[PDB]
Design an enzyme around this catalytic site. Structure first.
Site, PDB file in Angstrom:
ATOM      1  N   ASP A   1       5.591 -16.627   6.791  1.00 21.34           N
ATOM      2  CA  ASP A   1       5.476 -17.473   7.939  1.00 21.34           C
ATOM      3  C   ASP A   1       6.925 -17.750   8.351  1.00 21.34           C
ATOM      4  OD1 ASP A   1       6.115 -19.911   6.045  1.00 21.34           O
ATOM      5  OD2 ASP A   1       5.944 -20.722   8.029  1.00 21.34           O
TER       6      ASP A   1
ATOM      7  N   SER B   1       2.494  -4.281   3.994  1.00 21.52           N
ATOM      8  CA  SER B   1       1.215  -4.719   3.373  1.00 21.52           C
ATOM      9  C   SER B   1       1.510  -5.955   2.519  1.00 21.52           C
ATOM     10  CB  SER B   1       0.553  -3.729   2.406  1.00 21.52           C
ATOM     11  OG  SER B   1       0.587  -2.380   2.783  1.00 21.52           O
TER      12      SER B   1
ATOM     13  N   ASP C   1       3.644  -5.371   8.713  1.00 23.90           N
ATOM     14  CA  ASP C   1       2.185  -5.334   8.725  1.00 23.90           C
ATOM     15  C   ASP C   1       1.513  -6.011   7.537  1.00 23.90           C
ATOM     16  OD1 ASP C   1       0.004  -4.644  10.515  1.00 23.90           O
ATOM     17  OD2 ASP C   1      -0.579  -2.977   9.291  1.00 23.90           O
TER      18      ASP C   1
ATOM     19  N   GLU D   1       0.764 -21.783   4.903  1.00 22.89           N
ATOM     20  CA  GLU D   1       2.080 -21.161   4.858  1.00 22.89           C
ATOM     21  C   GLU D   1       2.722 -20.789   3.523  1.00 22.89           C
ATOM     22  OE1 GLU D   1       1.103 -23.750   7.210  1.00 22.89           O
ATOM     23  OE2 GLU D   1       3.116 -24.067   7.973  1.00 22.89           O
TER      24      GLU D   1
ATOM     25  N   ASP E   1      10.115 -18.713   6.116  1.00 23.56           N
ATOM     26  CA  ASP E   1      10.544 -18.152   4.876  1.00 23.56           C
ATOM     27  C   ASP E   1      11.931 -17.606   4.924  1.00 23.56           C
ATOM     28  OD1 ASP E   1       8.243 -19.064   3.889  1.00 23.56           O
ATOM     29  OD2 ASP E   1       7.154 -17.267   4.500  1.00 23.56           O
TER      30      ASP E   1
ATOM     31  N   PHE F   1       0.758  -1.265   0.000  1.00 22.34           N
ATOM     32  CA  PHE F   1       0.000   0.000   0.000  1.00 22.34           C
ATOM     33  C   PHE F   1       0.796   1.329   0.000  1.00 22.34           C
ATOM     34  CE2 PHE F   1      -3.993   1.996   0.349  1.00 22.34           C
ATOM     35  CZ  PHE F   1      -3.678   3.226   0.900  1.00 22.34           C
TER      36      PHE F   1
ATOM     37  N   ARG G   1       1.472 -17.516   2.233  1.00 20.11           N
ATOM     38  CA  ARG G   1       1.776 -16.363   3.117  1.00 20.11           C
ATOM     39  C   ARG G   1       3.104 -16.372   3.900  1.00 20.11           C
ATOM     40  NH1 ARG G   1       1.678 -17.873   8.041  1.00 20.11           N
ATOM     41  NH2 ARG G   1       0.508 -19.745   8.721  1.00 20.11           N
TER      42      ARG G   1
END
Lengths: 449, 85
Positions: free
Chosen positions: A193, A153, A177, A188, A196, A78, A191
Protein backbone atom coordinates in the site's frame (compact mmCIF):
# COMPACT_ATOMS: atom_id res chain seq x y z
CA UNK A 1 -0.51 -18.91 18.37
CA UNK A 2 2.64 -16.61 17.79
CA UNK A 3 6.02 -18.05 16.64
CA UNK A 4 9.38 -16.32 16.90
CA UNK A 5 12.43 -16.79 14.85
CA UNK A 6 16.05 -16.01 15.01
CA UNK A 7 16.64 -12.50 13.78
CA UNK A 8 13.35 -11.84 12.15
CA UNK A 9 11.36 -11.61 15.37
CA UNK A 10 7.99 -12.93 16.05
CA UNK A 11 5.14 -13.55 13.72
CA UNK A 12 1.68 -13.36 15.34
CA UNK A 13 -1.58 -15.08 14.02
CA UNK A 14 -4.13 -12.55 14.79
CA UNK A 15 -6.55 -10.78 12.65
CA UNK A 16 -5.69 -9.19 10.32
CA UNK A 17 -2.97 -11.72 9.51
CA UNK A 18 -5.31 -14.57 9.82
CA UNK A 19 -8.91 -15.02 10.63
CA UNK A 20 -10.43 -12.19 8.40
CA UNK A 21 -12.56 -13.38 5.53
CA UNK A 22 -10.05 -12.98 2.80
CA UNK A 23 -7.40 -14.95 4.68
CA UNK A 24 -9.47 -17.01 7.14
CA UNK A 25 -7.38 -20.16 7.84
CA UNK A 26 -4.84 -19.66 10.57
CA UNK A 27 -1.55 -20.56 9.06
CA UNK A 28 1.71 -19.09 10.46
CA UNK A 29 4.84 -18.48 8.47
CA UNK A 30 7.28 -21.42 7.96
CA UNK A 31 10.46 -20.47 9.56
CA UNK A 32 13.35 -18.60 8.02
CA UNK A 33 15.48 -21.74 7.30
CA UNK A 34 12.52 -23.28 5.69
CA UNK A 35 11.62 -20.19 3.60
CA UNK A 36 15.26 -19.79 2.73
CA UNK A 37 15.52 -16.34 1.38
CA UNK A 38 18.88 -16.30 -0.52
CA UNK A 39 20.08 -12.86 -1.74
CA UNK A 40 21.78 -13.38 -5.10
CA UNK A 41 23.80 -10.22 -6.04
CA UNK A 42 24.44 -9.03 -9.53
CA UNK A 43 26.25 -5.82 -10.45
CA UNK A 44 27.68 -3.99 -13.42
CA UNK A 45 30.95 -5.63 -12.52
CA UNK A 46 29.44 -9.15 -12.30
CA UNK A 47 26.64 -8.93 -14.74
CA UNK A 48 25.89 -12.46 -15.41
CA UNK A 49 27.12 -14.70 -12.58
CA UNK A 50 25.68 -13.87 -9.18
CA UNK A 51 27.48 -13.67 -5.90
CA UNK A 52 25.46 -14.61 -2.76
CA UNK A 53 25.63 -11.84 -0.12
CA UNK A 54 23.93 -11.62 3.21
CA UNK A 55 23.21 -9.15 6.00
CA UNK A 56 26.72 -9.16 7.68
CA UNK A 57 30.05 -7.53 6.99
CA UNK A 58 32.06 -10.68 6.17
CA UNK A 59 29.65 -11.17 3.22
CA UNK A 60 29.28 -7.59 2.00
CA UNK A 61 32.89 -6.72 2.46
CA UNK A 62 34.78 -8.32 -0.35
CA UNK A 63 32.00 -8.11 -2.83
CA UNK A 64 30.90 -6.02 -5.66
CA UNK A 65 28.13 -4.55 -3.47
CA UNK A 66 28.96 -0.85 -3.47
CA UNK A 67 27.57 1.79 -1.13
CA UNK A 68 27.84 4.70 -3.54
CA UNK A 69 25.32 3.42 -6.07
CA UNK A 70 21.68 2.32 -5.49
CA UNK A 71 20.52 -1.10 -4.55
CA UNK A 72 17.39 -2.51 -5.98
CA UNK A 73 16.08 -5.90 -5.07
CA UNK A 74 13.85 -7.95 -7.31
CA UNK A 75 11.52 -10.29 -5.25
CA UNK A 76 9.78 -13.00 -7.31
CA UNK A 77 6.32 -14.61 -6.71
CA UNK A 78 4.72 -16.93 -9.45
CA UNK A 79 7.59 -18.31 -11.60
CA UNK A 80 6.36 -19.81 -14.77
CA UNK A 81 8.06 -22.74 -16.51
CA UNK A 82 10.87 -21.31 -18.60
CA UNK A 83 10.54 -17.97 -16.63
CA UNK A 84 13.26 -18.81 -14.07
CA UNK A 85 15.64 -16.30 -15.72
CA UNK A 86 13.34 -13.25 -15.48
CA UNK A 87 14.88 -11.80 -12.33
CA UNK A 88 18.30 -11.83 -13.95
CA UNK A 89 17.08 -10.13 -17.09
CA UNK A 90 15.77 -7.18 -15.15
CA UNK A 91 19.35 -6.90 -13.80
CA UNK A 92 20.95 -7.15 -17.25
CA UNK A 93 18.92 -4.14 -18.53
CA UNK A 94 19.64 -2.02 -15.42
CA UNK A 95 23.23 -2.44 -16.31
CA UNK A 96 22.59 -1.16 -19.88
CA UNK A 97 21.55 2.22 -18.46
CA UNK A 98 23.08 2.49 -14.86
CA UNK A 99 25.56 1.38 -12.18
CA UNK A 100 23.55 -0.70 -9.77
CA UNK A 101 23.61 -3.25 -7.01
CA UNK A 102 20.96 -5.54 -8.42
CA UNK A 103 20.09 -8.04 -5.73
CA UNK A 104 17.57 -10.70 -6.91
CA UNK A 105 15.82 -12.28 -3.82
CA UNK A 106 15.27 -16.03 -4.01
CA UNK A 107 12.80 -17.86 -1.75
CA UNK A 108 11.79 -20.75 -3.84
CA UNK A 109 11.74 -22.88 -0.69
CA UNK A 110 9.10 -20.73 0.98
CA UNK A 111 7.14 -20.26 -2.26
CA UNK A 112 6.88 -23.88 -3.41
CA UNK A 113 3.87 -24.87 -1.26
CA UNK A 114 0.19 -24.11 -0.96
CA UNK A 115 -0.65 -20.63 -1.89
CA UNK A 116 -1.84 -19.87 1.63
CA UNK A 117 1.38 -21.09 3.09
CA UNK A 118 3.33 -18.90 0.69
CA UNK A 119 0.98 -15.88 1.41
CA UNK A 120 2.11 -16.38 4.95
CA UNK A 121 5.78 -17.13 4.28
CA UNK A 122 5.82 -13.80 2.44
CA UNK A 123 6.24 -12.42 5.91
CA UNK A 124 9.62 -13.93 6.40
CA UNK A 125 10.99 -12.69 2.98
CA UNK A 126 9.54 -9.35 4.08
CA UNK A 127 11.47 -9.16 7.32
CA UNK A 128 14.46 -10.69 5.50
CA UNK A 129 14.64 -7.76 3.10
CA UNK A 130 14.02 -5.21 5.88
CA UNK A 131 16.78 -6.80 7.88
CA UNK A 132 19.32 -6.46 4.98
CA UNK A 133 18.06 -2.90 4.42
CA UNK A 134 18.49 -1.90 8.03
CA UNK A 135 21.84 -3.67 8.04
CA UNK A 136 23.50 -1.64 5.27
CA UNK A 137 22.21 1.36 7.11
CA UNK A 138 23.82 0.52 10.51
CA UNK A 139 26.80 -1.28 9.21
CA UNK A 140 27.60 1.22 6.46
CA UNK A 141 25.37 4.27 6.89
CA UNK A 142 23.49 3.47 3.66
CA UNK A 143 20.21 5.25 3.59
CA UNK A 144 17.16 3.31 2.67
CA UNK A 145 16.36 6.12 0.25
CA UNK A 146 18.77 4.30 -2.13
CA UNK A 147 16.87 1.13 -1.93
CA UNK A 148 14.26 0.04 -4.48
CA UNK A 149 12.19 -3.15 -3.99
CA UNK A 150 10.54 -4.62 -7.10
CA UNK A 151 8.20 -7.59 -6.42
CA UNK A 152 5.88 -9.62 -8.69
CA UNK A 153 2.69 -11.67 -7.63
CA UNK A 154 3.12 -12.48 -3.83
CA UNK A 155 6.58 -10.87 -3.95
CA UNK A 156 4.98 -7.52 -4.32
CA UNK A 157 3.44 -8.05 -0.91
CA UNK A 158 6.84 -9.34 0.36
CA UNK A 159 8.31 -5.99 -0.64
CA UNK A 160 5.31 -4.41 0.95
CA UNK A 161 6.24 -6.15 4.23
CA UNK A 162 9.90 -5.22 3.91
CA UNK A 163 8.95 -1.62 3.48
CA UNK A 164 6.48 -1.78 6.29
CA UNK A 165 9.05 -2.98 8.72
CA UNK A 166 11.57 -0.33 7.49
CA UNK A 167 8.66 2.06 8.24
CA UNK A 168 8.40 3.45 4.78
CA UNK A 169 11.89 4.93 4.54
CA UNK A 170 12.60 2.77 1.52
CA UNK A 171 12.82 4.96 -1.52
CA UNK A 172 10.45 3.00 -3.76
CA UNK A 173 8.56 -0.29 -3.76
CA UNK A 174 7.26 -1.38 -7.18
CA UNK A 175 4.54 -3.91 -7.24
CA UNK A 176 4.39 -5.77 -10.43
CA UNK A 177 0.97 -7.21 -10.29
CA UNK A 178 0.28 -7.75 -6.62
CA UNK A 179 -1.45 -11.12 -6.25
CA UNK A 180 -5.06 -10.87 -5.38
CA UNK A 181 -6.01 -13.90 -3.21
CA UNK A 182 -5.52 -13.19 0.52
CA UNK A 183 -4.63 -9.55 -0.15
CA UNK A 184 -7.39 -7.54 -1.87
CA UNK A 185 -9.32 -5.30 0.47
CA UNK A 186 -7.32 -6.90 3.32
CA UNK A 187 -5.94 -4.08 5.57
CA UNK A 188 -2.74 -2.15 4.75
CA UNK A 189 -0.66 -4.16 7.23
CA UNK A 190 -1.28 -7.36 5.44
CA UNK A 191 -0.63 -5.84 1.91
CA UNK A 192 1.27 -3.47 -0.39
CA UNK A 193 0.00 0.00 0.00
CA UNK A 194 1.29 3.59 -0.49
CA UNK A 195 2.82 3.79 2.90
CA UNK A 196 5.34 1.03 2.44
CA UNK A 197 7.89 3.36 0.93
CA UNK A 198 8.39 6.98 0.08
CA UNK A 199 7.06 6.13 -3.38
CA UNK A 200 5.13 3.07 -4.51
CA UNK A 201 4.09 2.58 -8.14
CA UNK A 202 2.29 -0.50 -9.31
CA UNK A 203 1.65 -1.98 -12.81
CA UNK A 204 -1.73 -3.77 -12.86
CA UNK A 205 -1.96 -6.19 -15.77
CA UNK A 206 -3.90 -9.33 -14.80
CA UNK A 207 -6.58 -7.41 -12.65
CA UNK A 208 -9.53 -9.60 -13.67
CA UNK A 209 -11.26 -11.28 -10.64
CA UNK A 210 -9.50 -14.49 -9.66
CA UNK A 211 -12.76 -16.30 -9.36
CA UNK A 212 -14.57 -16.77 -11.63
CA UNK A 213 -11.97 -15.59 -14.07
CA UNK A 214 -8.39 -16.35 -12.83
CA UNK A 215 -7.56 -12.75 -12.45
CA UNK A 216 -4.50 -13.32 -10.43
CA UNK A 217 -3.54 -9.70 -10.12
CA UNK A 218 -5.11 -7.27 -7.76
CA UNK A 219 -7.29 -4.74 -9.29
CA UNK A 220 -7.53 -2.43 -6.30
CA UNK A 221 -5.43 0.59 -6.44
CA UNK A 222 -2.47 0.16 -4.04
CA UNK A 223 0.23 2.71 -5.13
CA UNK A 224 0.54 6.51 -5.42
CA UNK A 225 0.56 5.78 -9.14
CA UNK A 226 -1.28 2.70 -10.51
CA UNK A 227 -0.62 2.17 -14.22
CA UNK A 228 -3.25 -0.05 -15.99
CA UNK A 229 -1.64 -1.09 -19.31
CA UNK A 230 -4.13 -2.13 -21.93
CA UNK A 231 -6.76 -1.51 -19.30
CA UNK A 232 -5.27 -3.64 -16.53
CA UNK A 233 -7.09 -6.95 -17.34
CA UNK A 234 -6.28 -8.58 -20.76
CA UNK A 235 -2.90 -7.96 -22.42
CA UNK A 236 -2.35 -8.23 -26.16
CA UNK A 237 -0.44 -11.36 -26.77
CA UNK A 238 -1.95 -13.19 -23.86
CA UNK A 239 -4.28 -16.20 -24.16
CA UNK A 240 -7.14 -15.91 -21.69
CA UNK A 241 -7.89 -18.65 -19.12
CA UNK A 242 -11.25 -20.25 -19.24
CA UNK A 243 -13.90 -19.55 -16.65
CA UNK A 244 -14.56 -21.51 -13.40
CA UNK A 245 -16.68 -20.51 -10.35
CA UNK A 246 -14.45 -22.83 -8.29
CA UNK A 247 -10.89 -22.05 -8.73
CA UNK A 248 -8.14 -24.14 -7.22
CA UNK A 249 -5.65 -21.41 -6.14
CA UNK A 250 -3.18 -23.93 -4.55
CA UNK A 251 -3.39 -25.94 -7.79
CA UNK A 252 -2.73 -22.80 -9.93
CA UNK A 253 0.09 -21.94 -7.53
CA UNK A 254 1.94 -25.34 -7.32
CA UNK A 255 1.09 -25.98 -10.98
CA UNK A 256 -1.29 -28.94 -10.77
CA UNK A 257 -3.98 -27.09 -12.60
CA UNK A 258 -3.46 -25.18 -15.92
CA UNK A 259 -2.75 -21.45 -16.03
CA UNK A 260 -2.16 -18.85 -18.65
CA UNK A 261 0.11 -16.95 -16.56
CA UNK A 262 0.74 -14.59 -19.46
CA UNK A 263 -1.34 -11.74 -18.24
CA UNK A 264 0.28 -11.90 -14.80
CA UNK A 265 3.90 -12.29 -16.20
CA UNK A 266 3.46 -9.27 -18.49
CA UNK A 267 4.03 -6.68 -15.71
CA UNK A 268 7.70 -7.70 -15.42
CA UNK A 269 8.00 -7.95 -19.21
CA UNK A 270 6.67 -4.38 -19.47
CA UNK A 271 9.01 -3.26 -16.59
CA UNK A 272 12.01 -4.87 -18.32
CA UNK A 273 11.33 -3.16 -21.67
CA UNK A 274 10.66 0.05 -19.82
CA UNK A 275 14.28 0.15 -18.62
CA UNK A 276 15.56 0.50 -22.13
CA UNK A 277 12.70 2.63 -23.58
CA UNK A 278 12.40 5.73 -21.36
CA UNK A 279 9.52 7.58 -23.01
CA UNK A 280 8.07 4.53 -24.59
CA UNK A 281 5.30 3.84 -21.94
CA UNK A 282 3.59 7.14 -21.02
CA UNK A 283 0.64 6.83 -18.81
CA UNK A 284 -2.23 9.13 -19.42
CA UNK A 285 -4.34 10.09 -16.53
CA UNK A 286 -7.69 8.82 -17.72
CA UNK A 287 -10.53 7.80 -15.46
CA UNK A 288 -10.98 4.41 -17.13
CA UNK A 289 -9.61 2.58 -20.11
CA UNK A 290 -12.96 2.95 -21.83
CA UNK A 291 -12.91 6.87 -21.51
CA UNK A 292 -9.31 6.51 -22.65
CA UNK A 293 -9.93 4.44 -25.69
CA UNK A 294 -12.72 6.93 -26.55
CA UNK A 295 -10.07 9.40 -27.25
CA UNK A 296 -10.84 11.67 -24.34
CA UNK A 297 -7.67 11.80 -22.14
CA UNK A 298 -4.87 12.98 -24.46
CA UNK A 299 -2.31 14.65 -24.32
CA UNK A 300 -0.38 14.46 -21.09
CA UNK A 301 -1.18 17.24 -18.63
CA UNK A 302 0.75 20.29 -18.01
CA UNK A 303 3.46 18.48 -16.06
CA UNK A 304 3.86 15.29 -17.99
CA UNK A 305 2.48 11.91 -18.31
CA UNK A 306 4.32 9.49 -15.86
CA UNK A 307 6.38 6.82 -17.54
CA UNK A 308 4.94 3.37 -16.53
CA UNK A 309 7.65 1.15 -14.89
CA UNK A 310 11.29 1.89 -14.48
CA UNK A 311 11.34 5.58 -15.07
CA UNK A 312 8.24 6.52 -12.99
CA UNK A 313 10.49 8.01 -10.29
CA UNK A 314 11.11 10.89 -12.63
CA UNK A 315 7.45 11.99 -12.87
CA UNK A 316 7.44 15.24 -10.84
CA UNK A 317 4.02 14.80 -9.07
CA UNK A 318 4.28 11.10 -8.18
CA UNK A 319 3.39 11.43 -4.56
CA UNK A 320 0.78 14.18 -4.74
CA UNK A 321 -1.92 11.67 -4.10
CA UNK A 322 -2.38 8.07 -3.52
CA UNK A 323 -3.93 5.86 -6.06
CA UNK A 324 -3.69 8.10 -9.09
CA UNK A 325 -4.66 5.80 -12.08
CA UNK A 326 -3.00 6.20 -15.53
CA UNK A 327 -3.83 4.23 -18.72
CA UNK A 328 -1.84 3.35 -21.70
CA UNK A 329 -1.52 0.75 -24.53
CA UNK A 330 1.51 -1.33 -25.24
CA UNK A 331 2.54 -3.73 -27.87
CA UNK A 332 1.84 -7.31 -27.93
CA UNK A 333 5.46 -8.45 -27.76
CA UNK A 334 9.09 -7.75 -28.32
CA UNK A 335 9.65 -4.04 -27.76
CA UNK A 336 6.61 -3.33 -25.87
CA UNK A 337 6.67 0.37 -26.41
CA UNK A 338 4.32 2.67 -28.03
CA UNK A 339 3.96 6.38 -28.67
CA UNK A 340 0.42 7.87 -28.99
CA UNK A 341 -0.51 10.50 -31.45
CA UNK A 342 -3.75 12.38 -32.02
CA UNK A 343 -4.14 13.47 -35.72
CA UNK A 344 -6.99 15.59 -37.07
CA UNK A 345 -7.70 15.60 -40.89
CA UNK A 346 -9.85 18.23 -42.75
CA UNK A 347 -11.23 16.99 -45.99
CA UNK A 348 -11.00 18.76 -49.42
CA UNK A 349 -12.28 17.18 -52.64
CA UNK A 350 -15.40 15.24 -53.41
CA UNK A 351 -17.96 13.68 -51.11
CA UNK A 352 -17.15 10.02 -51.28
CA UNK A 353 -17.38 6.99 -49.08
CA UNK A 354 -13.96 5.60 -47.98
CA UNK A 355 -11.23 5.22 -45.51
CA UNK A 356 -8.88 8.12 -44.86
CA UNK A 357 -5.43 7.06 -43.48
CA UNK A 358 -2.55 9.23 -42.49
CA UNK A 359 1.15 8.42 -41.95
CA UNK A 360 3.81 10.53 -40.11
CA UNK A 361 7.50 11.21 -41.04
CA UNK A 362 9.86 12.94 -38.70
CA UNK A 363 13.53 13.35 -38.01
CA UNK A 364 13.86 9.88 -36.59
CA UNK A 365 11.54 7.77 -38.79
CA UNK A 366 8.06 7.13 -40.20
CA UNK A 367 5.01 5.33 -39.01
CA UNK A 368 2.91 3.09 -41.10
CA UNK A 369 -0.55 4.02 -42.29
CA UNK A 370 -3.04 4.44 -39.45
CA UNK A 371 -6.75 4.69 -40.42
CA UNK A 372 -8.40 7.84 -39.22
CA UNK A 373 -12.03 7.32 -40.36
CA UNK A 374 -14.25 5.19 -42.43
CA UNK A 375 -17.53 6.02 -44.16
CA UNK A 376 -18.71 9.32 -45.61
CA UNK A 377 -15.89 11.50 -46.53
CA UNK A 378 -17.58 14.85 -46.67
CA UNK A 379 -15.50 17.87 -47.86
CA UNK A 380 -14.60 20.37 -45.22
CA UNK A 381 -15.43 17.92 -42.46
CA UNK A 382 -12.71 17.23 -39.83
CA UNK A 383 -11.89 13.81 -38.26
CA UNK A 384 -9.59 12.88 -35.40
CA UNK A 385 -8.00 9.74 -34.09
CA UNK A 386 -5.53 8.77 -31.47
CA UNK A 387 -3.35 5.90 -32.29
CA UNK A 388 -0.39 4.01 -30.91
CA UNK A 389 2.52 4.28 -33.07
CA UNK A 390 4.92 1.66 -32.67
CA UNK A 391 7.50 4.37 -33.77
CA UNK A 392 8.43 7.59 -32.12
CA UNK A 393 8.95 9.67 -35.27
CA UNK A 394 10.79 12.53 -33.61
CA UNK A 395 9.66 16.00 -34.69
CA UNK A 396 7.38 15.63 -37.71
CA UNK A 397 8.55 16.87 -41.01
CA UNK A 398 5.77 15.91 -43.39
CA UNK A 399 2.63 13.77 -43.20
CA UNK A 400 0.96 11.77 -46.10
CA UNK A 401 -2.76 11.34 -46.71
CA UNK A 402 -4.41 8.43 -48.65
CA UNK A 403 -8.03 7.12 -49.05
CA UNK A 404 -9.73 4.12 -50.77
CA UNK A 405 -13.01 2.18 -50.71
CA UNK A 406 -14.13 -1.23 -52.00
CA UNK A 407 -16.46 -0.13 -54.73
CA UNK A 408 -15.38 0.66 -58.33
CA UNK A 409 -15.45 4.42 -58.44
CA UNK A 410 -16.96 5.59 -61.77
CA UNK A 411 -16.41 9.33 -61.46
CA UNK A 412 -12.78 8.62 -60.62
CA UNK A 413 -13.43 11.01 -57.59
CA UNK A 414 -10.64 12.98 -55.90
CA UNK A 415 -10.35 13.68 -52.16
CA UNK A 416 -7.34 15.24 -50.46
CA UNK A 417 -6.84 17.04 -47.19
CA UNK A 418 -6.83 20.70 -46.43
CA UNK A 419 -4.95 20.53 -43.15
CA UNK A 420 -3.79 17.66 -41.07
CA UNK A 421 -2.68 18.44 -37.47
CA UNK A 422 -0.56 16.02 -35.44
CA UNK A 423 -0.61 16.48 -31.63
CA UNK A 424 2.18 14.63 -29.87
CA UNK A 425 1.45 13.07 -26.44
CA UNK A 426 3.39 15.84 -24.76
CA UNK A 427 0.99 18.00 -26.76
CA UNK A 428 2.99 19.84 -29.44
CA UNK A 429 0.71 20.46 -32.45
CA UNK A 430 2.23 20.32 -35.84
CA UNK A 431 0.20 21.62 -38.88
CA UNK A 432 0.23 20.38 -42.46
CA UNK A 433 -1.55 21.80 -45.44
CA UNK A 434 -2.53 20.96 -49.04
CA UNK A 435 -4.55 22.53 -51.83
CA UNK A 436 -4.19 19.25 -53.74
CA UNK A 437 -6.67 16.46 -53.98
CA UNK A 438 -5.68 12.94 -55.19
CA UNK A 439 -7.18 9.98 -56.72
CA UNK A 440 -8.08 6.91 -54.74
CA UNK A 441 -4.91 5.18 -53.46
CA UNK A 442 -2.31 7.83 -54.21
CA UNK A 443 -0.21 9.33 -51.54
CA UNK A 444 -0.84 12.94 -51.04
CA UNK A 445 2.21 14.40 -49.16
CA UNK A 446 1.13 17.40 -47.01
CA UNK A 447 3.84 19.84 -45.68
CA UNK A 448 4.04 22.50 -42.93
CA UNK A 449 1.82 25.56 -42.90
CA UNK B 1 -15.70 -23.41 -47.54
CA UNK B 2 -13.54 -20.31 -48.17
CA UNK B 3 -11.92 -18.68 -45.16
CA UNK B 4 -11.95 -14.86 -44.96
CA UNK B 5 -10.94 -12.04 -42.63
CA UNK B 6 -8.13 -13.68 -40.52
CA UNK B 7 -6.36 -11.18 -38.26
CA UNK B 8 -2.71 -10.31 -37.66
CA UNK B 9 -1.04 -13.46 -36.48
CA UNK B 10 -3.73 -15.98 -37.33
CA UNK B 11 -2.36 -18.93 -39.29
CA UNK B 12 -3.21 -18.67 -42.95
CA UNK B 13 -2.71 -20.29 -46.31
CA UNK B 14 -2.72 -17.59 -48.85
CA UNK B 15 -3.00 -13.93 -48.45
CA UNK B 16 -6.75 -13.69 -49.42
CA UNK B 17 -7.43 -15.11 -45.99
CA UNK B 18 -5.86 -12.25 -44.26
CA UNK B 19 -7.48 -8.83 -43.59
CA UNK B 20 -4.23 -7.29 -45.03
CA UNK B 21 -3.63 -9.82 -47.62
CA UNK B 22 -0.19 -10.82 -46.70
CA UNK B 23 0.14 -14.33 -45.31
CA UNK B 24 3.83 -14.25 -44.44
CA UNK B 25 6.47 -16.75 -43.17
CA UNK B 26 10.10 -16.06 -43.04
CA UNK B 27 11.86 -19.33 -44.09
CA UNK B 28 10.42 -21.82 -46.35
CA UNK B 29 9.74 -24.20 -43.54
CA UNK B 30 7.75 -21.83 -41.27
CA UNK B 31 4.20 -21.73 -40.21
CA UNK B 32 2.76 -19.06 -42.26
CA UNK B 33 0.51 -16.50 -40.55
CA UNK B 34 -1.20 -13.12 -41.44
CA UNK B 35 1.25 -10.22 -41.31
CA UNK B 36 0.90 -6.51 -41.64
CA UNK B 37 1.80 -4.94 -45.06
CA UNK B 38 5.13 -3.15 -45.34
CA UNK B 39 5.56 0.45 -44.26
CA UNK B 40 7.04 3.03 -46.41
CA UNK B 41 10.75 2.51 -46.59
CA UNK B 42 10.88 -0.90 -45.01
CA UNK B 43 11.62 -3.98 -46.94
CA UNK B 44 8.94 -5.53 -49.01
CA UNK B 45 8.31 -8.41 -51.30
CA UNK B 46 7.05 -7.71 -54.77
CA UNK B 47 3.60 -9.00 -55.46
CA UNK B 48 3.63 -12.74 -55.85
CA UNK B 49 1.52 -15.48 -57.14
CA UNK B 50 1.98 -17.97 -54.38
CA UNK B 51 -0.09 -16.00 -51.92
CA UNK B 52 2.44 -16.53 -49.09
CA UNK B 53 5.21 -14.06 -48.88
CA UNK B 54 8.55 -14.01 -47.10
CA UNK B 55 8.32 -10.30 -46.74
CA UNK B 56 4.95 -8.51 -47.00
CA UNK B 57 3.87 -6.50 -50.00
CA UNK B 58 3.74 -2.72 -49.30
CA UNK B 59 0.90 -0.84 -47.74
CA UNK B 60 -1.28 1.36 -49.93
CA UNK B 61 0.12 3.43 -52.72
CA UNK B 62 3.83 2.71 -52.11
CA UNK B 63 5.72 0.91 -54.86
CA UNK B 64 8.20 -1.75 -53.73
CA UNK B 65 10.96 -1.01 -55.95
CA UNK B 66 13.50 -3.67 -55.81
CA UNK B 67 14.32 -6.16 -58.54
CA UNK B 68 11.56 -8.03 -60.13
CA UNK B 69 14.21 -10.13 -61.63
CA UNK B 70 14.08 -13.20 -63.87
CA UNK B 71 12.68 -16.56 -63.13
CA UNK B 72 14.32 -17.96 -59.98
CA UNK B 73 13.94 -14.46 -58.61
CA UNK B 74 10.40 -14.16 -59.58
CA UNK B 75 9.77 -17.86 -59.02
CA UNK B 76 10.51 -17.03 -55.22
CA UNK B 77 12.46 -14.01 -53.88
CA UNK B 78 11.97 -10.52 -55.58
CA UNK B 79 12.33 -8.07 -52.64
CA UNK B 80 12.61 -4.30 -52.49
CA UNK B 81 11.88 -1.20 -50.37
CA UNK B 82 8.42 0.52 -50.32
CA UNK B 83 8.86 3.92 -51.88
CA UNK B 84 6.26 6.45 -52.63
CA UNK B 85 5.70 6.10 -56.40
Amino acid sequence: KEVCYERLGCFSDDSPWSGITERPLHILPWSPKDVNTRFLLYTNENPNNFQEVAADSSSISGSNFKTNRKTRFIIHGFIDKGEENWLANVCKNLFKVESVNCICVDWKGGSRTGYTQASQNIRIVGAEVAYFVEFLQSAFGYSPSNVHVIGHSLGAHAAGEAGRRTNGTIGRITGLDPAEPCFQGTPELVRLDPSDAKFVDVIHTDGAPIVPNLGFGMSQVVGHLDFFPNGGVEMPGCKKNILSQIVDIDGIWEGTRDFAACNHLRSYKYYTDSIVNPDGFAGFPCASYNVFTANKCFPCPSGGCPQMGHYADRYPGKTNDVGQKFYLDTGDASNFARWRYKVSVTLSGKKVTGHILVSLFGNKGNSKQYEIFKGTLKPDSTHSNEFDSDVDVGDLQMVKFIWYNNVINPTLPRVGASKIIVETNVGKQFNFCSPETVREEVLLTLTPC
Amino acid sequence: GIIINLDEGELCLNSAQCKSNCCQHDTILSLLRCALKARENSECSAFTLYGVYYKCPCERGLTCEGDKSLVGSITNTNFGICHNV
